[PDB]
Design a protein around this ligand. Structure first.
Ligand code: CA
Ligand code: CA
Ligand code: CA
Ligand code: CA
Ligand code: CA
Ligand code: CA
Ligand code: CA
Length: 316
């Protein structure tokens, strides 16, 4: 089913690539284009082996040398590209959570779209890297039913997908209907429990059944019932339940639609998904916005940043 756009380079020689990169950085100036070109064509695992070889040949740290060399967006992109896969989401969440700053955009995006298996992996990689517990960090920086919905999701405890029980499907669509539209106010506790714990395939049936009973798609009710971060988060969760690729594709579209470019989100989703499902994300993107992702990136960005980004997307 899923497909990323970056694979392992056949005929990889770690040590040959470290020499290319030394040479691209040695002395006056920088050859961005050999870096760019070499690195968007190696898998993340291969980038780690290259970083190892560079260190045993030159006693130098590859990423440190690269960030003295490079600047701006392209620096940020090559650095994200060099982050170990198993550490990148942990890193982005730690960086969303920190200082005064908490950036709900990133927290909502990662935690709503990662599977239980990935949230487990992420929670383990965060405490082992940052010496703080992820849940405790989120709680500390968030409030309300937004906070609670993130903790539910952080339990990575969604029900398995067994066979569908149609009475349960009816029972949950009716409960959501009584919790929001038939309610003066909203029973957010009900929404967080059903949306937060039920298996994915059962929620796909609930959403349709909800449509049938109410005449509304669940998104429309979420929008009528809730405001702010919690609205944002429940929308993100619902979208991810129907399709993580499609959700991420519209995260992308909106980063670079809104006049400027949310370079942070562009780098973050392209790099995070490049070996998971970025192919399928480009599919959902062509389907819904009637542009190729390539064409939209090619026009919203520039330089070596644009070149690297397009080599990572691929497409026609
Ligand atoms: Ca140099
Ligand atoms: Ca720099
Ligand atoms: Ca904070
Ligand atoms: Ca709190
Ligand atoms: Ca209501
Ligand atoms: Ca609203
Ligand atoms: Ca734009």
């Amino acid at each position: 089913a899923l497909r990323g756009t970056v694979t392992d380079f056949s005929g990889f020689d770690g040590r040959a690539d470290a020499e290319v990169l030394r040479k691209a950085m040695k002395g006056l100036g920088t050859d961005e284009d050999s870096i760019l070109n070499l690195l968007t064509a190696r898998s993340n695992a291969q980038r780690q082996q290259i970083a190892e070889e560079f260190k045993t040949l030159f006693g130098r740290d590859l990423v440190n040398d690269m960030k003295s060399e490079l600047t701006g967006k392209f620096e940020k992109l090559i650095v994200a590209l060099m982050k170990p896969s198993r550490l990148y989401d942990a890193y982005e969440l730690k960086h969303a959570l920190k200082g005064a700053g908490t950036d709900e955009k990133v927290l909502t995006e990662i935690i709503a779209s990662r599977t239980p298996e990935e949230l487990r992996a992420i929670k383990q990689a965060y405490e082992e890297e940052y010496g703080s517990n992820l849940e405790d960090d989120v709680v500390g920086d968030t409030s309300g039913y937004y906070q609670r919905m993130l903790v539910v999701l952080l339990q990575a405890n969604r029900d398995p997908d067994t066979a569908i029980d149609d009475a349960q499907v009816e029972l949950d669509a009716q409960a959501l209907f009584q919790a929001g539209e038939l309610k003066w106010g909203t029973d957010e506790e009900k929404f967080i429990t059903i949306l937060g714990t039920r298996s994915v395939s059962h929620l796909r049936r609930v959403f349709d059944k909800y449509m049938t009973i109410s005449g509304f798609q669940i998104e429309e009710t979420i929008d009528r019932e809730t405001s702010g971060n919690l609205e944002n988060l429940l929308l993100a969760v619902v979208k991810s339940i129907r399709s993580i690729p499609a959700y991420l594709a519209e995260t992308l579209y909106y980063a670079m639609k809104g006049a400027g470019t949310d370079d942070h989100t562009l780098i973050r989703v392209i790099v995070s998904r490049s070996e998971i499902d970025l192919f399928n994300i480009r599919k959902e993107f062509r389907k819904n916005f009637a542009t190729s992702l390539y064409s939209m990136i090619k026009g919203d960005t520039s330089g070596d940043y644009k070149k690297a980004l397009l080599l990572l997307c691929g497409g026609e």
